Amino acid sequence: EGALIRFYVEIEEPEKFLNCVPEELKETLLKEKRIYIDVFTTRPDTVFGATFVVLAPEHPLVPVLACIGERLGNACYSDVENFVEKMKKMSTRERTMEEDKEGVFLGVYATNPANGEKIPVWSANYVLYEYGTGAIMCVPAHDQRDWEFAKKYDLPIKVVVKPEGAWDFEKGAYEGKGTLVNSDGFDGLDSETAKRKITEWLQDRGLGEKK
């Protein structure tokens, strides 16, 4: 149980980037000026708290988005390539026995469909291609794996599920239930209710589905 959520990289001048993308993505790029990054989440109640996106190293969009990020002057393509190559060699245990999460910035920013914020797209070892779509939204305030990655790479922490009791978000992620904050029209909702309400809203807009 969860939601597919359609994040997307907006591309204002598609002709400048056409050679970064395969034929299969060209239609959407030219017509919609977007490259979609579909994520699966069991926490759609936290979507407003997404401060970055992570693709598994083997995700087909990694070279596509890195090509674009190089083209924008934001990414080091060789850094990305070296990371993917290193990851081909690492076992599941070696990628998830986390005493130093590893990732690389792809140089592009995905638009969050919930709030329109532009958030950086990374690839990282701790995200397995086999989980969901192989790309995740990262909510360091409420996901411990994401919190640790954000700590290492200096990424923003945004609280969207407020616990009733005290919590120092500068010490760990709060993974439990609460009421929404920083969630625009969904502010004040209990987080379980918000899972449904947010998912239906995205689905109504063609930017998500119950899954």
Q: What's the CATH number where 12 sits?
A: 3.90.740.10
| Pair 30, 14: CB distance under 8 Å | yes
Token code pair at residue 42: 């069991």
DSSP state, residue 148 = H
Q: What is the CA radius of gyration of the chain?
A: 17
Phi, psi for residue 183 in degrees, rounded to 5: -125, 30
Count of domains for the chain: 1
Elucidated via? X-ray
Return d(Cα 103, Cα 151) in angstroms, integer.
12
Q: Which of 41, 49, 4, 6 is nearest to 180 (CA)?
A: 49
Which residue, among 119, 120, 175, has the nearest Cα to 143 in the 3D structure? 175
To one decimal, the resolution in angstroms is 1.8
User: Is the distance from CB of 206 to CB of 114 less than 8 angstroms?
Assistant: no
Give the CA distances from residue 24 to residues 21, 30, 74, in Å, rounded to whole numbers and listed in that order: 8, 11, 25
Domain range for 113 is 1-211
Give ∠ CA 109-115-116 in degrees, rounded to 5.
40
209 near 203, Cβ under 8 Å?
yes
